[model samples]
Target: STNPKPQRKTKRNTNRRPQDVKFPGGGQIVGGVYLLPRRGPRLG
Candidate 1:
């Protein structure tokens, strides 16, 4: 049996989003980073 360990969550980086991929939350394109718009914390 081949069992692999789960990967830990981390901040987004250049490797995650390519040139065409859209950011999950609405963010502005800044060089090589996705800058999310400033807003209040969203509540459920």
Candidate 2:
């Protein structure tokens, strides 16, 4: 027979779609800024 594991501390709840405050390499683009023709090289 297999034994069941006991639950310890309560697990933290996670958000479905967490909002990103900032970008990794400072490549965050706003909605209005993206409408412009030219900005800079897209970090790919």
Per-candidate local distance difference test: 0.44, 0.45
lDDT by residue (16-40, candidate 1, tens digit) is: 5464345435534452243334333
lDDT of 2 by residue, 1-44 (tens): 64567554467436532233222245363532453545555857
Clashing residue pairs, backbone N/CA/C < 3 A, model 2 = none
TM-score of 2: 0.17
lDDT for model 1: 0.44
> Which portions of model 2 show Cα errors greater than 4 Å?
1-29, 38-44
- TM-score per prediction, in order, is 0.16, 0.17
